[PDB]
Design an enzyme around this catalytic site. Structure first.
Site, PDB file in Angstrom:
ATOM      1  N   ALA A  44       4.871 -17.404  -0.482  1.00 31.10           N
ATOM      2  CA  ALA A  44       5.798 -16.575   0.327  1.00 31.10           C
ATOM      3  C   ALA A  44       6.809 -15.875  -0.578  1.00 31.10           C
ATOM      4  O   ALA A  44       7.304 -14.810  -0.175  1.00 31.10           O
ATOM      5  CB  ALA A  44       6.507 -17.411   1.375  1.00 31.10           C
ATOM      6  N   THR A  48       9.139 -11.828  -0.553  1.00 31.79           N
ATOM      7  CA  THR A  48      10.604 -11.917  -0.327  1.00 31.79           C
ATOM      8  C   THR A  48      11.192 -10.518  -0.586  1.00 31.79           C
ATOM      9  O   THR A  48      12.061 -10.119   0.197  1.00 31.79           O
ATOM     10  CB  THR A  48      11.281 -13.058  -1.096  1.00 31.79           C
ATOM     11  OG1 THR A  48      10.871 -13.217  -2.454  1.00 31.79           O
ATOM     12  CG2 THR A  48      11.142 -14.382  -0.367  1.00 31.79           C
ATOM     13  N   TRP A  62      12.719 -23.228   6.083  1.00 32.69           N
ATOM     14  CA  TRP A  62      13.051 -24.670   6.136  1.00 32.69           C
ATOM     15  C   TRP A  62      14.458 -24.945   5.575  1.00 32.69           C
ATOM     16  O   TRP A  62      15.208 -25.659   6.256  1.00 32.69           O
ATOM     17  CB  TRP A  62      11.996 -25.533   5.447  1.00 32.69           C
ATOM     18  CG  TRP A  62      10.591 -25.360   5.935  1.00 32.69           C
ATOM     19  CD1 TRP A  62       9.467 -25.553   5.177  1.00 32.69           C
ATOM     20  CD2 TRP A  62      10.118 -24.969   7.240  1.00 32.69           C
ATOM     21  NE1 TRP A  62       8.336 -25.323   5.917  1.00 32.69           N
ATOM     22  CE2 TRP A  62       8.703 -24.969   7.186  1.00 32.69           C
ATOM     23  CE3 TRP A  62      10.735 -24.671   8.465  1.00 32.69           C
ATOM     24  CZ2 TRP A  62       7.912 -24.628   8.279  1.00 32.69           C
ATOM     25  CZ3 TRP A  62       9.953 -24.321   9.545  1.00 32.69           C
ATOM     26  CH2 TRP A  62       8.559 -24.303   9.452  1.00 32.69           C
ATOM     27  N   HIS A 124      -3.883 -20.430   5.139  1.00 33.34           N
ATOM     28  CA  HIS A 124      -3.053 -20.724   6.321  1.00 33.34           C
ATOM     29  C   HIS A 124      -3.288 -19.681   7.419  1.00 33.34           C
ATOM     30  O   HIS A 124      -2.544 -19.722   8.430  1.00 33.34           O
ATOM     31  CB  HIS A 124      -1.604 -20.899   5.839  1.00 33.34           C
ATOM     32  CG  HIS A 124      -1.511 -21.976   4.817  1.00 33.34           C
ATOM     33  ND1 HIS A 124      -0.386 -22.187   4.013  1.00 33.34           N
ATOM     34  CD2 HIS A 124      -2.437 -22.888   4.426  1.00 33.34           C
ATOM     35  CE1 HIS A 124      -0.620 -23.193   3.208  1.00 33.34           C
ATOM     36  NE2 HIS A 124      -1.891 -23.629   3.435  1.00 33.34           N
ATOM     37  N   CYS A 157     -13.812 -11.018  23.061  1.00 37.21           N
ATOM     38  CA  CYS A 157     -14.720 -10.470  22.019  1.00 37.21           C
ATOM     39  C   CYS A 157     -15.443  -9.245  22.582  1.00 37.21           C
ATOM     40  O   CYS A 157     -15.633  -9.192  23.809  1.00 37.21           O
ATOM     41  CB  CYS A 157     -15.749 -11.499  21.574  1.00 37.21           C
ATOM     42  SG  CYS A 157     -16.536 -11.092  19.997  1.00 37.21           S
ATOM     43  N   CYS A 161     -20.374 -10.202  23.970  1.00 36.08           N
ATOM     44  CA  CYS A 161     -20.137 -11.655  23.738  1.00 36.08           C
ATOM     45  C   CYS A 161     -19.054 -12.180  24.687  1.00 36.08           C
ATOM     46  O   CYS A 161     -19.197 -13.325  25.155  1.00 36.08           O
ATOM     47  CB  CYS A 161     -19.744 -11.926  22.291  1.00 36.08           C
ATOM     48  SG  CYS A 161     -18.927 -13.526  22.051  1.00 36.08           S
ATOM     49  N   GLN A 226      11.946 -21.181  -8.722  1.00 33.42           N
ATOM     50  CA  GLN A 226      12.263 -22.618  -8.542  1.00 33.42           C
ATOM     51  C   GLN A 226      11.195 -23.440  -9.254  1.00 33.42           C
ATOM     52  O   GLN A 226      10.127 -22.926  -9.565  1.00 33.42           O
ATOM     53  CB  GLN A 226      12.284 -23.017  -7.072  1.00 33.42           C
ATOM     54  CG  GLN A 226      13.483 -22.493  -6.309  1.00 33.42           C
ATOM     55  CD  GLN A 226      13.346 -22.817  -4.843  1.00 33.42           C
ATOM     56  OE1 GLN A 226      12.247 -23.053  -4.350  1.00 33.42           O
ATOM     57  NE2 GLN A 226      14.463 -22.856  -4.135  1.00 33.42           N
TER      58      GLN A 226
HETATM   59  N1  LIG Z   1      10.940 -12.650  -6.032  1.00 30.98           N
HETATM   60  C1  LIG Z   1      10.510 -13.863  -6.383  1.00 30.98           C
HETATM   61  N2  LIG Z   1       9.972 -14.053  -7.608  1.00 30.98           N
HETATM   62  C2  LIG Z   1       9.490 -15.262  -7.934  1.00 30.98           C
HETATM   63  N3  LIG Z   1       9.518 -16.392  -7.233  1.00 30.98           N
HETATM   64  C3  LIG Z   1      10.067 -16.167  -6.033  1.00 30.98           C
HETATM   65  C4  LIG Z   1      10.604 -14.994  -5.556  1.00 30.98           C
HETATM   66  N4  LIG Z   1      11.108 -15.186  -4.287  1.00 30.98           N
HETATM   67  C5  LIG Z   1      10.855 -16.438  -4.026  1.00 30.98           C
HETATM   68  N5  LIG Z   1      10.246 -17.070  -5.042  1.00 30.98           N
HETATM   69  C6  LIG Z   1       9.839 -18.458  -5.104  1.00 30.98           C
HETATM   70  O1  LIG Z   1       8.716 -18.539  -4.277  1.00 30.98           O
HETATM   71  C7  LIG Z   1       8.522 -19.900  -3.857  1.00 30.98           C
HETATM   72  C8  LIG Z   1       7.956 -19.863  -2.478  1.00 30.98           C
HETATM   73  O2  LIG Z   1       7.526 -21.200  -2.155  1.00 30.98           O
HETATM   74  P1  LIG Z   1       7.692 -21.737  -0.685  1.00 30.98           P
HETATM   75  O3  LIG Z   1       8.894 -21.099  -0.068  1.00 30.98           O
HETATM   76  O4  LIG Z   1       7.474 -23.206  -0.729  1.00 30.98           O
HETATM   77  O5  LIG Z   1       6.372 -21.059  -0.044  1.00 30.98           O
HETATM   78  P2  LIG Z   1       4.794 -21.450  -0.145  1.00 30.98           P
HETATM   79  O6  LIG Z   1       3.993 -20.182  -0.050  1.00 30.98           O
HETATM   80  O7  LIG Z   1       4.648 -22.320  -1.343  1.00 30.98           O
HETATM   81  O8  LIG Z   1       4.661 -22.284   1.189  1.00 30.98           O
HETATM   82  C9  LIG Z   1       3.458 -23.042   1.438  1.00 30.98           C
HETATM   83  C10 LIG Z   1       3.373 -23.229   2.921  1.00 30.98           C
HETATM   84  O9  LIG Z   1       4.496 -24.041   3.335  1.00 30.98           O
HETATM   85  C11 LIG Z   1       4.976 -23.597   4.593  1.00 30.98           C
HETATM   86  O10 LIG Z   1       5.163 -24.689   5.424  1.00 30.98           O
HETATM   87  C12 LIG Z   1       3.899 -22.607   5.083  1.00 30.98           C
HETATM   88  O11 LIG Z   1       2.788 -23.242   5.674  1.00 30.98           O
HETATM   89  C13 LIG Z   1       3.456 -21.962   3.773  1.00 30.98           C
HETATM   90  O12 LIG Z   1       2.198 -21.285   3.776  1.00 30.98           O
HETATM   91  C14 LIG Z   1       9.883 -20.582  -4.017  1.00 30.98           C
HETATM   92  O13 LIG Z   1       9.854 -21.565  -5.011  1.00 30.98           O
HETATM   93  C15 LIG Z   1      10.824 -19.467  -4.532  1.00 30.98           C
HETATM   94  O14 LIG Z   1      11.691 -19.942  -5.532  1.00 30.98           O
HETATM   95  C1  LIG Z   2       4.808 -22.575   9.275  1.00 30.46           C
HETATM   96  C2  LIG Z   2       5.412 -21.336   9.819  1.00 30.46           C
HETATM   97  C3  LIG Z   2       6.639 -20.969  10.187  1.00 30.46           C
HETATM   98  C4  LIG Z   2       6.516 -19.631  10.575  1.00 30.46           C
HETATM   99  N1  LIG Z   2       7.480 -18.758  11.075  1.00 30.46           N
HETATM  100  S1  LIG Z   2       7.404 -17.139  10.900  1.00 30.46           S
HETATM  101  O1  LIG Z   2       8.652 -16.598  11.336  1.00 30.46           O
HETATM  102  O2  LIG Z   2       6.190 -16.708  11.519  1.00 30.46           O
HETATM  103  C5  LIG Z   2       7.286 -16.835   9.173  1.00 30.46           C
HETATM  104  C6  LIG Z   2       6.079 -16.474   8.585  1.00 30.46           C
HETATM  105  C7  LIG Z   2       6.021 -16.267   7.217  1.00 30.46           C
HETATM  106  C8  LIG Z   2       7.179 -16.336   6.433  1.00 30.46           C
HETATM  107  N2  LIG Z   2       7.147 -16.109   5.083  1.00 30.46           N
HETATM  108  C9  LIG Z   2       8.383 -16.684   7.053  1.00 30.46           C
HETATM  109  C10 LIG Z   2       8.434 -16.935   8.402  1.00 30.46           C
HETATM  110  N3  LIG Z   2       5.292 -19.198  10.472  1.00 30.46           N
HETATM  111  O3  LIG Z   2       4.566 -20.299   9.969  1.00 30.46           O
HETATM  112 ZN   LIG Z   3     -17.781 -13.076  19.835  1.00 32.33          ZN
END
Ligand SMILES: Nc1ncnc2c1ncn2[C@@H]1O[C@H](COP(=O)(O)OP(=O)(O)OC[C@H]2O[C@H](O)[C@H](O)[C@@H]2O)[C@@H](O)[C@H]1O
Ligand SMILES: Cc1cc(NS(=O)(=O)c2ccc(N)cc2)no1
Ligand SMILES: [Zn+2]
Length: 282
Positions: A44, A48, A62, A124, A157, A161, A226
């Site tokens: 994610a 950002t 979170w 996901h 669909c 279907c 991070q």
């Molecule tokens: N511009 C940037 N440059 C580099 N790093 C960055 C930047 N902005 C943010 N970060 C880093 O980007 C990192 C983002 O990590 P996390 O926020 O854990 O996202 P996930 O993709 O691992 O989340 C996994 C699943 O967890 C959820 O429950 C959902 O199911 C997700 O799919 C952080 O360490 C930031 O410091």
């Molecule tokens: C898990 C979970 C929370 C959530 N909420 S959300 O608002 O759809 C969302 C989706 C992606 C990002 N980067 C931030 C927020 N969607 O999946």
């Molecule tokens: Zn179908």
């Protein structure tokens, strides 16, 4: 939900000072050149800079929940523009320098960037994607599908279907799509370079895939502001905004970051475009 362990949230940022950052991105340049099979793993942190907050960053979904605060969006999912990073990854695939892209992101921005779906695992799922329960036919929509948690969207669909259409967004209890996970796993084991981009690598099994590249002697690069669960198993860590890293990397590789035409879906990768000749490394 409540019960869900949302891991370590809001750890401090690391900023590699410029001299060390410029050196490390040159070393990432060297590894991309030295490597036959480069797989990229995104989270994610690569959206950002498009106005979409992450999960565990200082202002993540979170993290802000934990302080009684709300994540803040500077865009809608629909109006979100793919980043410099997103578009770097499109070119790296087009010129044969990216074998596979494994993403945890549901933001849909890989697909909208023009990135070929047959080289993307969306572990996901994808907020713009609904799947026919009957015939497994996926539709990529121009707007977000209304539901999450593999529920009925209220559309049917239309294959030559009348199947129930459902969102592809996993709930906590839900296990990953096997097709995407098996190809993700396959790319990850086969890779000789796995590069992680704005993920914290805290979610099983997504966060463990980069480590499979380590077995059989592959290199691991983690780019992230991070710390990440697996900082220890990395041959290179870059603490930097991922857009600055990728724009410098692309500049070192001699590659232009292509223009975004607006939302487009490419199902299958086209054969590689020319690429610059390799520098003498050793
Ligand atoms: N511009 C940037 N440059 C580099 N790093 C960055 C930047 N902005 C943010 N970060 C880093 O980007 C990192 C983002 O990590 P996390 O926020 O854990 O996202 P996930 O993709 O691992 O989340 C996994 C699943 O967890 C959820 O429950 C959902 O199911 C997700 O799919 C952080 O360490 C930031 O410091
Ligand atoms: C898990 C979970 C929370 C959530 N909420 S959300 O608002 O759809 C969302 C989706 C992606 C990002 N980067 C931030 C927020 N969607 O999946
Ligand atoms: Zn179908």
């Amino acid at each position: 939900p409540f019960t869900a362990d949302k891991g370590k949230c809001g750890l401090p940022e690391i900023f590699d000072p410029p001299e060390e950052l410029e050196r490390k991105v040159w070393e990432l340049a060297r590894l991309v050149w030295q490597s036959s099979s480069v797989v990229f793993h995104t989270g994610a942190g690569i959206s950002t800079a498009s106005g979409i907050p992450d999960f565990r960053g200082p202002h993540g979904v979170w993290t802000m929940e934990e302080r009684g605060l709300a994540p803040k969006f500077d865009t809608t999912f629909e109006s979100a523009r793919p980043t410099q990073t997103h578009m770097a990854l499109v070119q790296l695939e087009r010129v044969g320098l990216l074998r596979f892209l494994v993403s945890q992101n549901v933001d849909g921005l890989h697909v909208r960037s023009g990135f070929p779906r047959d080289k993307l695992a969306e572990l996901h799922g994808n907020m713009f994607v609904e799947e026919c329960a009957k015939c497994k036919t996926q539709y990529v929509r121009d707007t977000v599908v209304g539901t999450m948690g593999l529920k009925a969207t209220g559309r049917l669909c239309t294959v030559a279907c009348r199947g129930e259409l459902r969102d592809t967004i996993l709930d906590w209890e839900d296990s990953l799509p096997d097709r995407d996970l098996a190809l993700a796993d396959e790319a990850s084991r086969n890779a000789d370079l796995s590069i992680t981009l704005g993920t914290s690598l805290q979610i099983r099994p997504s966060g463990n895939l980069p480590l499979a590249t380590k077995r059989r002697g592959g290199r691991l690069v983690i780019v992230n502001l991070q710390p990440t669960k697996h900082d220890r198993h990395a041959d290179l860590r870059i603490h930097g905004y991922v857009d600055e890293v990728m724009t410098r990397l692309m500049k070192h590789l001699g590659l232009e970051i292509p223009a975004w035409d607006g939302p487009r879906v490419l199902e299958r990768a086209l054969p590689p475009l020319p690429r610059p000749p390799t520098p003498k490394l050793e």
